Amino acid sequence: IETVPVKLKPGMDGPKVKQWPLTEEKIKALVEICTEMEKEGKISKIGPENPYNTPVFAIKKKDSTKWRKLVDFRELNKRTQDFPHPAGLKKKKSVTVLDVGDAYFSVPLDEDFRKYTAFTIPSINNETPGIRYQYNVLPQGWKGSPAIFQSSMTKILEPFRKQNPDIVIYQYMDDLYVGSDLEIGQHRTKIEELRQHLLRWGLTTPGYELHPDKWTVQPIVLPEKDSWTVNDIQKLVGKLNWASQIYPGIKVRQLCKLLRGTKALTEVIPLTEEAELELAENREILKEPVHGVYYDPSKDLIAEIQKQGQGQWTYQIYQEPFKNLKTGKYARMRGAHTNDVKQLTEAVQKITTESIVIWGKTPKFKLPIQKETWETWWTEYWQATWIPEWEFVNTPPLVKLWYQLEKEPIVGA
Amino acid sequence: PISPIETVPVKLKPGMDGPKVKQWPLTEEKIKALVEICTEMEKEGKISKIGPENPYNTPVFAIKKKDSTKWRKLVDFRELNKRTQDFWEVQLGIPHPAGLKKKKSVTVLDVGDAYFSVPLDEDFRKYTAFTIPSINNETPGIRYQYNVLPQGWKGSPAIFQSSMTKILEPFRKQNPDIVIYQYMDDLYVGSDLEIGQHRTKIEELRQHLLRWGLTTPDKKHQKEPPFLWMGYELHPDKWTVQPIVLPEKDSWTVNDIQKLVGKLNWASQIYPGIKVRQLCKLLRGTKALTEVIPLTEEAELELAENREILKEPVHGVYYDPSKDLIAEIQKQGQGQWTYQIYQEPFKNLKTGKYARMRGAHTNDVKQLTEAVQKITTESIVIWGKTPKFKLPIQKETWETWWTEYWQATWIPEWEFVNTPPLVKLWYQLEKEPIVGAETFYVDGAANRETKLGKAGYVTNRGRQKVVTLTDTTNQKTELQAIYLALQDSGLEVNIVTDSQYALGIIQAQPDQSESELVNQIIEQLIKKEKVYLAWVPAHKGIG
Numbered sequence: 041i042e043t044v045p046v047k048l049k050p051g052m053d054g055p056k057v058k059q060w061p062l063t064e065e066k067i068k069a070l071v072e073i074c075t076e077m078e079k080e081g082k083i084s085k086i087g088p089e090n091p092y093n094t095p096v097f098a099i100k101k102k103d104s105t106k107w108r109k110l111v112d113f114r115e116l117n118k119r120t121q122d123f124p125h126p127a128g129l130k131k132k133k134s135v136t137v138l139d140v141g142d143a144y145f146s147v148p149l150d151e152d153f154r155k156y157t158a159f160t161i162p163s164i165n166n167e168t169p170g171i172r173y174q175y176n177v178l179p180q181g182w183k184g185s186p187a188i189f190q191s192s193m194t195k196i197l198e199p200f201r202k203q204n205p206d207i208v209i210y211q212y213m214d215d216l217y218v219g220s221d222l223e224i225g226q227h228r229t230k231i232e233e234l235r236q237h238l239l240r241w242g243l244t245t246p247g248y249e250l251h252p253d254k255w256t257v258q259p260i261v262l263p264e265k266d267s268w269t270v271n272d273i274q275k276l277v278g279k280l281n282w283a284s285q286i287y288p289g290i291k292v293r294q295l296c297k298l299l300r301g302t303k304a305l306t307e308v309i310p311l312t313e314e315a316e317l318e319l320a321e322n323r324e325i326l327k328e329p330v331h332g333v334y335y336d337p338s339k340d341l342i343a344e345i346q347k348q349g350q351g352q353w354t355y356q357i358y359q360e361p362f363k364n365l366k367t368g369k370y371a372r373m374r375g376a377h378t379n380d381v382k383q384l385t386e387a388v389q390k391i392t393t394e395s396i397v398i399w400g401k402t403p404k405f406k407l408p409i410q411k412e413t414w415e416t417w418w419t420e421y422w423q424a425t426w427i428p429e430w431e432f433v434n435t436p437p438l439v440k441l442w443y444q445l446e447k448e449p450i451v452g453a
Numbered sequence: 454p455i456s457p458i459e460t461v462p463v464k465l466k467p468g469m470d471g472p473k474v475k476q477w478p479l480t481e482e483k484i485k486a487l488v489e490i491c492t493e494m495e496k497e498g499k500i501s502k503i504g505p506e507n508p509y510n511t512p513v514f515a516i517k518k519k520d521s522t523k524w525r526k527l528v529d530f531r532e533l534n535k536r537t538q539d540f541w542e543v544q545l546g547i548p549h550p551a552g553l554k555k556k557k558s559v560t561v562l563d564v565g566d567a568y569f570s571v572p573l574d575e576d577f578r579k580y581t582a583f584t585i586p587s588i589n590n591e592t593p594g595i596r597y598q599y600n601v602l603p604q605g606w607k608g609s610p611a612i613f614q615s616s617m618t619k620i621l622e623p624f625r626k627q628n629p630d631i632v633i634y635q636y637m638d639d640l641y642v643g644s645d646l647e648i649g650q651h652r653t654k655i656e657e658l659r660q661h662l663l664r665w666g667l668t669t670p671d672k673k674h675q676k677e678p679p680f681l682w683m684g685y686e687l688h689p690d691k692w693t694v695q696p697i698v699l700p701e702k703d704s705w706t707v708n709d710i711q712k713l714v715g716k717l718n719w720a721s722q723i724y725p726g727i728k729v730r731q732l733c734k735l736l737r738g739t740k741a742l743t744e745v746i747p748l749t750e751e752a753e754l755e756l757a758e759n760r761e762i763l764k765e766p767v768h769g770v771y772y773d774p775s776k777d778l779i780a781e782i783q784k785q786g787q788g789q790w791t792y793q794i795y796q797e798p799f800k801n802l803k804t805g806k807y808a809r810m811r812g813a814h815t816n817d818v819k820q821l822t823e824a825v826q827k828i829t830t831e832s833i834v835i836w837g838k839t840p841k842f843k844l845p846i847q848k849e850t851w852e853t854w855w856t857e858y859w860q861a862t863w864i865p866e867w868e869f870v871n872t873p874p875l876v877k878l879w880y881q882l883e884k885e886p887i888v889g890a891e892t893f894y895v896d897g898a899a900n901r902e903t904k905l906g907k908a909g910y911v912t913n914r915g916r917q918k919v920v921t922l923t924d925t926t927n928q929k930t931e932l933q934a935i936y937l938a939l940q941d942s943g944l945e946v947n948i949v950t951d952s953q954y955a956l957g958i959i960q961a962q963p964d965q966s967e968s969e970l971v972n973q974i975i976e977q978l979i980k981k982e983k984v985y986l987a988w989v990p991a992h993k994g995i996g
């Protein structure tokens with residue numbers, strides 16, 4: 041097959057990322073997968089003359105008891121040359137993600153660019169030199185990949201597209217998001233049909249899937265008591281004062297007046313009529329998301345995560361601080377009780393998914409965890425073809441207390 | 454000897470051209486030698502004479518050898534190495550002894566000369582041009598160029614490795630029961646074959662390398678176990694550390710002290726007991742590196758004490774995959790932890806220790822976690838697996854901590870080992886106001902310009918105080934306010950403050966910090982049985 045010439049952004053050089061140490065277990069899996077791919081002419085061994093390198097690792101998806109190879113092409117992608125997203129699926133009743141990744145292995149990649157796809161399989165205790173490979177066909181996780189397979193993909197989908205316009209198909213890298221408003225039965229089966237359609241063309245394409253709008257940005261609720269103590273008011277005031285950053289209409293003077301005088305924190309204070317109003321008024325302001333916040337396509341999305349303890353986590357997707365596009369409270373996944381990393385990774389994934397569905401873009405994560413810890417175990421629970429950008433931060437206490445007050449349904453479902 | 458292996462495509466850095474540095478003048482003697490030697494390797498096909506069409510040049514030198522009284526040669530490839538492309542890696546990470554598997558017999562193949570056996574990329578050969586001058590300040594000189602990998606050239610080490618990798622690939626496959634380690638010119642081969650069987654395979658290997666123009670010594674040569682490998686001493690059943698010798702002298706210079714402390718600090722890893730506390734003191738206010746320091750008696754005892762510890766030669770054992778990996782950790786003090794990874798009790802694989810720096814604000818439990826993490830990573834790189842942990846901490850202690858920490862953290866499957874001192878939470882802030890306890894409304898402020906401030910308090914019980922502070926900053930002032938509050942408070946206290954820093958103490962509650970003031974506050978906090986710290990918006994009406 042003829043190949044499209046791919047190049048790096050002007051002035052950029054190939055990625056030279058260092059390989060992370062992998063446990064023996066997954067190292068075996070990589071060798072197994074790599075030798076197989078080598079024979080199939082997917083990848084070729086390279087010498088030391090190639091200085092470029094990208095990290096690799098193996099993961100096991102839920103409901104999958106066989107290893108899969110994932111590469112961290114993030115560095116390469118950011119350096120790759122640039123070459124649509126609907127809205128409907130955001131409003132859809134149910135969405136199903138399909139792994140159309142394999143299809144790329146069919147298309148060959150521009151000879152000269154291949155050098156940049158270099159990767160290494162590490163050796164235990166540095167006993168032997170790592171096996172150095174290089175891609176020949178399109179690599180999974182690479183951005184240029186879907187950007188090249190586009191042609192074949194559109195055609196392959198056209199029939200289903202035209203015979204089922206009531207469904208929305210979106211492709212984000214190795215994933216194919218198919219959403220429909222049809223009830224559970226028809227949808228599941230229709231997906232199965234779409235699958236078989238792909239199967240017929242060659243590539244195997246593997247409750248049910250997602251649900252777009254059952255995700256509502258819940259407001260912040262303020263507590264109510266029959267009587268308040270100095271301490272309570274102090275807490276309330278502390279929160280409000282901060283909240284004014286998002287809602288400038290929030291005032292707290294009247295409450296502050298009741299908080300004047302060196303009295304016991306346990307001491308109860310009757311709310312003055314004027315304070316009652318100020319409080320009530322603030323509740324009103326807080327009843328809905330701030331106006332004016334609009335998604336700017338050219339700017340990157342940011343996602344802050346906060347550990348709430350007890351398995352809960354809070355997050356915010358925004359572009360400019362306080363001007364959040366969405367907010368949410370993630371609950372611990374049934375089982376991941378002993379470790380935060382599990383919950384964190386899971387959270388990271390769920391959020392990105394939503395970022396994709398809604399904006400079709402990967403948000404930068406501000407992870408509340410020490411680099412060392414994250415780098416060492418994230419792979420162990422990662423179950424996504426993509427890897428989002430991230431940075432680590434020292435979570436400010438104030439923001440945590442605020443979102444902690446996110447409204448919760450009297451009964452979820 | 455010259456192998457028929459495919460050369461590696463080597464090219465110069467983007468936009469650079471080959472070396473053109475001139476050659477140095479030499480004495481009649483060194484010239485004779487260079488001619489002899491160069492003609493020697495010329496006949497062997499290692500180097501070849503070149504015509505004037507090559508503008509490149511590199512300086513060659515001569516010098517009598519290491520106990521031989523015979524002249525050797527050396528080419529200064531600096532310039533060439535500066536222009537040569539960057540290669541991936543020359544395996545920067547050596548196999549740690551503890552990670553080796555016990556083999557019934559090992560053999561060391563000294564594949565040294567091999568560098569001059571692997572052919573260089575023909576196109577590149579031209580860049581290795583060098584000249585043997587003439588006395589007569591002649592016309593031209595004896596020009597040559599390398600056809601094989603040059604000793605000292607940037608790419609040689611890397612290329613040689615891969616070439617070797619390729620050559621050994623088949624043998625390994627047809628002999629999966631044999632393990633080989635590559636280290637520059639040394640090729641270590643080990644297995645569990647009855648002595649004779651082993652010897653035979655080694656010979657096959659030798660014959661193999663031979664076919665590919667790789668000369669190897671006869672008789673299973675030169676070195677024999679114990680293998681003195683980089684500070685380590687490898688024996689068939691255990692590895693030992695080379696005797697670290699301490700220079701017993703009577704005059705000590707700054708430099709000599711620093712160097713000493715250095716060795717002593719490396720030793721601490723394998724010898725959990727070594728101390729340099731006093732030794733470091735001898736470096737305070739040093740004017741010159743050559744300045745002599747009168748060794749204090751405290752230092753004499755310390756240095757001497759260290760000698761007694763280093764008297765006992767330590768030895769670790771090898772890895773046996775058929776057994777679990779256990780890692781035990783201990784706390785020798787605030788910020789100092791010791792660990793020993795083993796399979797069978799007392800039969801240690803690797804040991805070490807980590808020294809921390811209190812930083813802005815940390816706590817023991819946090820540090821334990823940070824240790825477990827480091828240890829884990831070390832294990833994965835060595836034994837490709839994570840060890841089971843034996844830690845000096847209560848499961849309850851852990852639970853209470855991590856379930857409430859602001860940052861995500863985790864410690865792999867571990868087991869409690871009751872070995873004092875156990876790490877415990879020195880204090881725990883109350884989650885709500887203490888009933889029937891004094892409430893201190895603390896506050897402090899200082900002029901940023903004049904560094905003059907005031908810090909004090911007032912209680913719901915009527916009590917009050919204030920102190921004017923000279924040369925200080927608002928941060929210190931606020932902290933000071935909280936400090937005083939704790940001083941005159943009592944066993945149970947409620948303290949309200951508008952300090953942002955205090956908020957940090959609330960969210961992390963550290964048991965150590967760099968700021969002595971904070972340390973004071975901490976010690977004070979540890980004394981109280983009930984403390985509730987609360988924060989309120991600054992510049993507002995709360996007072």
Ligand SMILES: Cc1c(Sc2ccccc2)n(COCCO)c(=O)[nH]c1=O
Nearest residue numbers: 553554555556559641643678687688689
């Ligand atoms: C190669 C090899 C070695 S030798 C070695 C040399 C350098 C680095 C690593 C191992 N040794 C050490 O045994 C020595 C005494 O019998 C070992 O125990 N197993 C091995 O596989």
